[PDB]
Design a protein around this ligand. Structure first.
Ligand SMILES: Cc1cc2nc3c(=O)[nH]c(=O)nc-3n(C[C@H](O)[C@H](O)[C@H](O)COP(=O)(O)OP(=O)(O)OC[C@H]3O[C@@H](n4cnc5c(N)ncnc54)[C@H](O)[C@@H]3O)c2cc1C
Ligand SMILES: Nc1ccn([C@@H]2O[C@H](COP(=O)(O)OP(=O)(O)OC[C@H]3Oc4nc5nc(N)nc(O)c5nc4C(S)=C3S)[C@@H](O)[C@H]2O)c(=O)n1
Ligand SMILES: Nc1ccn([C@@H]2O[C@H](COP(=O)(O)OP(=O)(O)OC[C@H]3Oc4nc5nc(N)nc(O)c5nc4C(S)=C3S)[C@@H](O)[C@H]2O)c(=O)n1
Ligand code: FES
Ligand code: FES
Ligand code: FES
Ligand code: FES
Lengths: 783, 153, 289, 160, 53, 153
């Protein structure tokens, strides 16, 4: 990794020197003069009218500088704020609390400890209501109406969505030899980044400039949304997304706490820091998943998948906070047809409200693609089970062929490129699929439970063409600026915001590749909206498909302009100039060459530049994707299940990913490995559960179990390179791929291990108890 | 209350409330923001510091309790402008992405390498099993610790 | 982060100083050892002591692990790490190493203490079960003086011990017998997670028969009467698989597990049986090796 | 002119960047550095004149080389002749792009658009008008922009 | 001038009473050999220059 | 040495060296950077602050000497979010450019307007004759002070 390529390839990350020394600058590190600390009193009830709020005792606390309630915000018109799904969501609960852990009031105090004490001092009179916790009964007649805030709302129905052709799918199913129906749940889980959400809002009382240090993955989106929501002038808003301690989609939304910090600063004319505790994070910020999916797969008796039908009941929490493009309320779930050549596909999805925190799009879901991929890969393993055919053989026969691309799926998605069989076979060879099968058979002879699970998935990442994909009206096209300093060092300003994905390295490499400036000579700037171009931020693995493409293209613009300047300098025709990785030289005379540094100096230097050319070596671009990128993966999990305790151990995980051109293989490996750990966590232990009373049972890291290093194997990864044709450097997103593909691989592995017990499906989390219940023939969804 | 302790080899004395958790005393009072916190239930391990040579969840220790003890953080790991082998291994092996767990992880890894010069992958996993990394998948962390162990050798 | 409410802090310079602090300070004073049970509770504001008497300075005087031929004495201030690392203890009471390896994580083990775990008296936690299985005798000391409480007497209820407010656990005394070993097995959803269900067993073997046996169950709400009935039924039985299976059935009957996030009650009962069998077999194999 | 005037080899031409935020507020980044000459006002006024964005809605950024384009700074009374000219021209570039976007939004030929201090309207109907703020949102907004046009309402210039 | 050469990142942040912060940044890169992309010259509010700066 | 004084109406106590000039104690120690300094010889007047209601060159006063006295700076001039008429007049009449001398100038102008509600241009010039403004030419400062005077009326 200590190589120093001028461009793509392995290289040490440029963020590491500071992180390894504890010199990262995360939001909670931000100490500003006079900074106050904000703590948010959370609802103890899942569903309760707020009769009254008494804040006199908290206000009387000698260290408490302000106590703010939903009434106070409503006076300022900030009691509600739009969600990313065009819903509204309480900033502070005013009429009722619609989920436990929901924001009810906040206290600004001299220090965090005093702020929490003061919260204890606040007295809220609740009238508890019946909670809507079971998403299956949310639409039942007489279910309490959560969204009484909405005029005329009489049910907990959030939205109806559909994709594909119902009639074509019905006809195919009528003619199908084999129809396999399986209900599967994708239980509510949480991104749970190690750094919780937080914001230091410093509204300078004189200049009126809001400087908002925030754990935001989309600082520009957030800046624009703050301007729109708080009425603050956008040119007087500087959202600083500092080093982020992991986002995983958790830091995409604007949370009520950010607004509350802004209000606290406004009120007090002081910096106000709100750092959420873990319990607030788990119970109030964006959950992920929480789908109940009835899949039906129609095939021929030989295993040609004909049609796939999905009926999704989506649990969206109290408010539809799903961070999805406007035209895609169900996100990219339409890719549920997967990597397979099928005749027809239909999905109908019902999103319902429940007394739980909003969210759903988070945790490396790629806009519900985790749900679609788990749906389809689990369903395909169910189909294999029914056909009594090797799941790998099933998949391999149904996989889309390379010549089919660009492939328009039955749900309208145009897959950019892919050689699925090659990647799948690579994964099978690497994992030694047949050898694993022999060993598993021998173990079953011995009574031991060995599962081989697999998933083949097509991601759809890089949102996206503005014509289709916009976040709250913001086209998902990314700006990128490149500036070559006179001395030949460069600065690339991105609209993407790393939360650990290595952007400061990889974008340096993209530019280095295009321009010949060494990556160490390229400062990658990001997260500070005052010095970065507008863009949609980092989520949906879009940084490389969108901002990466933009960076490559802007570097090329700078190279073209540099060619003009260099042709002037070499006193040569522009046609006689050859680009040589960092330098232009006259054809046939390499010695008649000028480096990008020489050209940069000249571009700022004395003497007239070529006619019609402006000085400097700056370029900018707003890259609008033509299409998403469709990286894909062939994941193979090997699990052992203790037959006595039903404890599942992941013995192996081979992940073969194809994300097109690879900018940085070490960073890519890290991204996959992290995704594999996420999948194991979801497949085996992670879940935010609620009791019948609506109490969040996963409000802490004691109850929301994230895999430790001991739960996960030494990961093995392979890759194939099938570049995206429409991408300037052929790179596809990878960030969420492993998280998308691994859950179905792990669940398939556990179900395969449970084969001796006649288990065709068991739902995650596959905890020891739930796996044992599946062994008993009593497999039931956790919800 | 007054507390006196050695933080990264420097004696420090401060007026702290008895209830002040050590992580907050380090980060907020002493400005040693290398040490992180990520949970309320002593679960995540991002607060791990070295108290008397042993990894300790600074979130589960009062500053008042640390009084009279030596507390070492990631800030003290680089000695005389020289990275500790754990730090260098973490950089070389991509043992961090967002870096939030990294201070605690490297404190734990350095303690382990002190007590075990040549740890197996299992011993590394076990030693860090109290510390959550959301980003890396832990394989690169094991590789980082192996790298530090092998270079220290 | 969730942080504790205000309280006053006192650092005990000795056992007698700690006991005197508890006596003067009163019911609202609490000892803090490793703080890995108390401090999380106070951070969550479940526990709000007016005073903490930090006994970490007693870690040397009370942090011993002493293995005599007929008696293991483990100081209250013994870190879980010290108990896990004590190879002589492992020779005499392997159950301790078993539980320690599956208790919390290494960092927590560096701080949490046997005394802290015992006085926490959390039925969902493993050391109370281990110290009940081994027939431990807690040694309490207060202003009145020093006294010995049987582990069964010491553990009077969930989160309640026989210790008075002004009394501190000083050491736990565990009888050692020849041809005796012990084992602990725990099922947790995740490493460091509290036991989904745990079982421990200490057995004495005279030849191939069982001379004495104790089975403890963790997180399943064991019935001490039923567990004692199972132990008495094990007396004089062969150390075979049939005996272990019968003990597992009795253990199934000896607990009242509750379906919760950690698993179904039926799964907890199955674990009571299977872990009882596993621990009994392990303890026997340890006696025979 | 860089052909004649350079400081230690640095041509004395000034960069200026203009960026219209989605909500229609603007930021102009200058290569000049005020020492009290009022640049934060005047350059706002130059841009306001060209673009119709009120000066109070234009943040003038200067003095911080990490977020400003390269230029020769302030001396020789050059800020207005050089950076002022650059600012006017970059504002006009943004106005021309905005005209393209506005013609798209008005579903009109670019020729039928008339600029009216902050707004494009079809000649004839002032009512068929879109402000620079509307165009800024559209430039960042959903739906395809006019063919060949990049989004954003940003422009930069190096004025010689 | 407040020169803050961050010892780790090696980034020079130079608050300076400079009328030509970019010219100064380039000159610093040339004179001290510092990488120009790791030099941030911050000319804050200047209390009068008159060419002096 | 310990010094105690009222700074902008707030009692403040600090440990200062006897030699610490008041301007440095305000700027550095108290972080009241509104007060400036521009000379070694008590000539420029950029450090003028209010000590016991009178414009004083804080560069020519030791913090130790200010002890027991009330010291008012430009920071204290805006009261309850409302600009003093001197501040508003300076903004309205372009009585500042670089703003360096402005704090002192406005302190002097406020003191003058307190003692003289309706100053003449000559009186204003004399009152500020100890304070150098390199940027404005002083005519706009006179206009600013006249504006503040006439609005106070
Ligand atoms: C993340 C995590 C995971 C855990 N997992 C497990 C697990 O899997 N299994 C398990 O069994 N435990 C587990 N624990 C609990 C851990 O074992 C205990 O928290 C720890 O042993 C308590 O010891 P301590 O010295 O920290 O006690 P403290 O918190 O200091 O004290 C606990 C209680 O005992 C009292 N006390 C302490 N010492 C004495 C004394 N000498 N005399 C009288 N009273 C005293 C205190 O006043 C208090 O009431 C876990 C804890 C954490 C934080
Ligand atoms: N062909 C490719 C594709 C990507 N990369 C490198 O891999 C990284 C991931 O790129 P990309 O796929 O564009 O994903 P993003 O950078 O957009 O990251 C988002 C993605 O990142 C994921 N992984 C994360 N990893 C860390 N440490 N922290 C998060 O918050 C993360 N969040 C998750 C979530 S959730 C998602 S959306 C970038 O450095 C990139 O250059 C590459 O070298 N070659
Ligand atoms: N036709 C014009 C020309 C200028 N201006 C406005 O007048 C000011 C001065 O513009 P310009 O003449 O371009 O001069 P600079 O801004 O480049 O200032 C440099 C100049 O500024 C002078 N005046 C100064 N004034 C103050 N307060 N401080 C300095 O350091 C000053 N330095 C001196 C010296 S020396 C010089 S070189 C700018 O706000 C400008 O927009 C205008 O409104 N209309
Ligand atoms: S903050 Fe999570 S373990 Fe300390
Ligand atoms: S590097 Fe992000 S949590 Fe470990
Ligand atoms: S600093 Fe010049 S008069 Fe005081
Ligand atoms: S305004 Fe510049 S010195 Fe007076």
């Amino acid at each position: 990794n200590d190589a120093k390529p001028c461009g793509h390839g392995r290289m040490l990350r440029k963020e590491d020197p500071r992180f390894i020394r504890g010199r990262g600058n995360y939001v909670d590190d931000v100490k500003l003069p006079g900074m106050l600390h904000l703590a948010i009193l959370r609802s103890p009830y899942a569903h309760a009218t707020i009769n009254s709020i008494d804040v006199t005792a908290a206000q009387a606390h000698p260290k408490v500088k302000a106590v703010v309630t939903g009434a106070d915000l409503a006076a300022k018109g900030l009691a509600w704020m739009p969600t990313l799904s065009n819903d509204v969501q309480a900033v502070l609960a005013t009429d009722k609390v619609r989920f436990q852990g929901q924001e009810v009031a906040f206290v600004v105090a001299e220090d965090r400890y005093s702020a929490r004490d003061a919260l204890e001092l606040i007295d809220v009179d609740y009238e508890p209501l019946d909670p809507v916790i079971d998403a299956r009964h949310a639409l039942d007649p007489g279910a309490p109406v959560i969204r009484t805030d909405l005029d005329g709302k009489t049910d907990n129905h959030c939205f109806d969505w559909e994709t594909g052709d119902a009639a074509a799918t019905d006809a195919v199913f009528a003619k199908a030899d084999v129809v396999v129906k399986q209900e599967m749940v994708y239980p509510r889980v949480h991104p749970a980044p190690m750094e919780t959400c937080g914001a230091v809002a410093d509204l300078d009382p004189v200049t009126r400039k809001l400087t908002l240090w925030s754990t935001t993955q989309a600082p520009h989106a957030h800046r624009t949304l703050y301007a729109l929501v708080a009425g603050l002038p956008e040119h007087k808003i500087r959202v600083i997304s500092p080093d982020i301690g992991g986002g995983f989609g958790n830091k995409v939304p604007i949370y009520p706490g950010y607004v509350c910090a802004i209000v606290g600063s406004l009120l007090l004319g002081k910096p106000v820091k709100w750092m959420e505790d873990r319990s607030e994070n788990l119970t109030s910020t964006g959950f992920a998943r929480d789908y109940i999916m009835v899949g039906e797969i129609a095939a021929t008796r030989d295993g040609k998948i004909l049609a796939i039908r999905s009926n999704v009941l989506a649990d969206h929490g109290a408010f539809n906070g799903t961070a999805a493009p406007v035209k895609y309320p169900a996100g990219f779930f339409g890719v549920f047809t997967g990597s397979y050549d099928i005749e027809a596909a239909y999905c109908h999805m019902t999103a319902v409200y429940t007394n739980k925190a909003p969210g759903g799009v988070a945790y490396a879901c790629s806009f519900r693609i985790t749900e679609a991929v788990y749906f389809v890969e689990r369903l395909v393993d169910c189909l294999a089970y029914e056909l009594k055919m090797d799941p790998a053989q099933l998949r391999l026969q149904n996989l889309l062929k390379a010549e089919q691309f660009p492939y328009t799926s039955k749900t309208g998605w145009v897959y950019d490129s892919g050689d699925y069989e090659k990647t799948m076979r690579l994964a099978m060879e690497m994992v030694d699929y047949e050898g694993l099968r022999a060993e598993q058979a021998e173990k079953r002879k011995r009574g031991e439970l060995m599962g081989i699970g697999m998933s083949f998935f097509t991601e759809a990442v890089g949102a996206g063409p503005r014509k289709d994909m916009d976040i709250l009206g913001l086209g998902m096209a990314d700006g990128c600026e490149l500036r070559v300093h006179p001395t030949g060092k460069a600065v690339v300003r991105l609209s993407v915001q790393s939360q650990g994905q290595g952007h400061e390295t990889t974008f340096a490499q993209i530019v280095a590749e295009e321009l010949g400036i060494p990556p160490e000579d390229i400062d990658v700037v990001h997260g500070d909206t005052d010095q970065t171009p507008f863009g949609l931020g980092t989520y949906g693995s879009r940084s490389t498909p969108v901002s990466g493409a933009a960076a490559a293209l802007v570097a090329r613009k700078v190279r073209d302009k540099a060619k003009i300047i260099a042709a002037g300098m070499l006193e040569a025709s522009i046609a006689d100039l050859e680009w040589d990785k960092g330098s232009f030289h006259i054809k046939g005379d390499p010695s008649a060459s000028v480096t990008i540094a020489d050209i940069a100096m000249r571009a700022h230097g004395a003497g007239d530049l070529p006619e019609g050319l402006e000085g400097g070596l700056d370029a900018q671009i707003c890259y609008n994707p033509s299409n998403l990128t469709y990286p894909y993966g062939a994941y193979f999990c090997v699990v052992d299940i203790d037959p006595g305790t039903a404890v599942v151990k992941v013995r192996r995980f081979v992940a073969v990913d194809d994300c097109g051109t690879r900018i940085n293989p070490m960073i890519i490996e890290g991204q996959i490995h992290g995704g594999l750990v996420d999948g194991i966590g979801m497949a085996l232990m992670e879940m935010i559960a609620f009791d019948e009373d609506g109490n969040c049972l996963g409000g802490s890291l004691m109850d929301y179990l994230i895999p430790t290093a001991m739960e996960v194997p030494h990961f093995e990864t392979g890759h194939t390179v099938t570049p995206s044709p429409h991408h300037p450097i052929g790179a596809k997103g990878i960030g969420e791929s492993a998280t998308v593909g691994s859950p179905p691989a792990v669940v398939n592995a556990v179900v395969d291990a449970l084969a001796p017990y006649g288990v065709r499906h068991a739902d995650m989390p596959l905890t020891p108890s739930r796996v044992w219940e599946a062994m008993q023939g009593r497999a039931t969804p956790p919800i | 209350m007054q507390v006196t302790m050695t933080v990264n080899g420097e004696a420090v004395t401060a007026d702290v409330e008895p209830r002040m958790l050590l992580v907050h005393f380090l980060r907020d009072q002493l400005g040693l923001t290398g040490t992180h916190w990520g949970c309320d239930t002593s679960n995540c391990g991002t607060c791990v510091v070295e108290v008397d040579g042993e990894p300790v969840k600074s979130c589960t220790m009062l500053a008042a309790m640390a009084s009279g003890h030596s507390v070492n953080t990631v800030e003290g790991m680089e000695v005389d402008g020289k990275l500790d082998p754990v730090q260098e291994g973490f950089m070389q092996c991509h043992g961090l992405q967002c870096g939030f767990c990294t201070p605690g992880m490297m404190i734990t890894a350095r303690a382990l390498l002190r007590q075990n010069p040549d740890p197996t992958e299992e011993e590394i996993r076990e030693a860090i099993s109290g510390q959550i990394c959301r980003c890396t998948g832990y394989t690169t962390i094991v590789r980082s610790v192996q790298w530090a162990a092998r270079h220290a050798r | 982060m969730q942080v504790p409410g205000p309280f006053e802090y006192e650092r005990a310079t000795s056992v007698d100083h700690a006991v005197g602090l508890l006596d003067r300070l009163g019911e609202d004073a609490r000892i803090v050892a490793g703080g890995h049970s108390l401090l999380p509770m106070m951070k969550l504001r479940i526990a709000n002591p007016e005073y903490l008497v930090d006994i970490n300075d007693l870690a040397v005087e009370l942090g011993y692990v002493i293995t005599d031929p007929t008696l293991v004495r483990i100081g209250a201030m013994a870190r879980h790490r010290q108990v896990l690392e004590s190879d002589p203890l492992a020779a005499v009471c392997p159950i301790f190493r078993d539980a320690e390896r599956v208790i919390a994580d290494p960092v927590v083990r560096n701080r949490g203490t046997l005394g802290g775990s015992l006085c926490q008296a959390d039925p969902a936690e493993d050391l109370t079960t281990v110290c009940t299985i081994l027939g431990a005798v807690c040694l309490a000391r207060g202003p009145g003086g020093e006294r010995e409480i049987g582990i069964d007497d010491f553990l009077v209820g969930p989160y309640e011990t026989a210790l008075a407010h002004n009394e501190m656990l000083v050491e736990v005394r565990i009888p050692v017998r020849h041809r005796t070993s012990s084992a602990y097995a725990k099922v947790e959803r995740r490493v460091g997670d509290w036991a989904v269900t745990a079982a421990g067993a200490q057995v004495t073997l005279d030849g191939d028969s069982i001379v004495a046996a104790r089975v403890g169950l963790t997180a399943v709400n064991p019935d001490p009467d039923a567990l004692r009935a199972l132990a008495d039924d094990l007396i004089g039985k062969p150390a075979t698989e049939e005996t272990f299976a019968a003990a597992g059935e009795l253990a199934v009957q000896a607990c009242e597990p509750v379906t919760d996030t950690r698993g179904s009650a039926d799964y907890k009962r199955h674990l009571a049986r299977e872990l009882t069998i596993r621990t009994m077999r392990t303890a026997v194999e340890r006696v025979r090796t």
